[PDB]
């Protein structure tokens, strides 16, 4: 099941954030206004076009709060090219990339995590790469990842955090009507780069 | 889906509460620890065994929630003989009842709903009472409710807020070994009461 009501915990941050400026809480408003952004852009519907530079600034909200919390344990990067922003792209495309990568560092480090995500353009295609320094992903999540992205489906597991990668993998194909959108790059001890390959699409 | 990742949420409220304590924002303080205690609760392991007072505290942190930004549209009430307060339940059996009432009552009226909440003994059982002065819910939806209380699965459809009813009714059926665990009283324009019938079990 799904053992929470987002909803009501939306409106619940609201209440919190008008509480903490009526006290003047000045940096404790500012964390409510990023979380209660990325609550708000995943509670959108899903189905939805948005565009990379909407991506990306629900990644900058993401990156404030995490380095509120772990500014000595990782490092982000961020970097985009301005012309690739105007892309239409599913929503929720870039966070569960995000949110795989930091897992990854967190479990891999104490200190000297490194997360970076890289937006440019490459022949005809927009790249948003992102890339951590773990312990490099496990063979089969990699295989069953990588059979999905050529169109075999993987094996059923019973139990089949939110949208993986799985999901974030066939929306894209979907969307843009083909299917080599993605390529992983991982090797025991060098870490992992998810490549995201999406066709330009100038509107 | 899920669209959001609650354990991010949870630590993210976690270092807005940090923030409101290093700012001396006493209010908004209190108000993150009533959902702070809340998510914690609804992510902990849904097969647990809890008590009623463990279910009646987080219904108090949820009508002080509540209170602080719908004070004068609803009013809310609670009582509980405390002998009661001991017995076995799963855990998330008041909140969905709440939050049913609740959004019957929000939807009702824009000043004047109530919603109230008893627990007291009645021959071997626990009754737990959730009352509403709602416009009453659909003939249909009452319905298929009460044939899944007497053992009969309803209608499959398509897109079967989080825990509903029918969730909660089964869990209760199963954990007591009962399945006469429920009945709804009903009518347009008089409300609902979702009255819980629980085997008395001391231990």
Known sequence: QSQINPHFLFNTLNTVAKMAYLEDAQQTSRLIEAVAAILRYNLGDLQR???????????????????????????????????????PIPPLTLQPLIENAFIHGIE??????????????????????????????????KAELEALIRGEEPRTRREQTGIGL??????????????????????????????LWLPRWQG
């Open 49 to 87: 076009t948005v565009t990379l530079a909407d991506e990306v600034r629900i990644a900058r909200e993401y990156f404030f709060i995490q380095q509120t919390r772990f500014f000595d344990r990782i490092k982000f990067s961020l970097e985009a090219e301005p012309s690739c922003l105007d892309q």
């Open 108 to 141: 891999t480090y104490e200190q000297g995590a490194e997360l970076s995500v890289s937006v440019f353009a490459e022949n005809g295609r927009v790249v948003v790469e992102v890339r951590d320094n773990g312990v490099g992903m496990d063979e089969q999540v």
């Open 166 to 195: 799985h999901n974030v993998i066939r929306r894209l194909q979907l969307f843009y009507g083909v299917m080599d959108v993605a390529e992983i790059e991982s090797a025991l001890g060098k870490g992992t780069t998810v490549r």
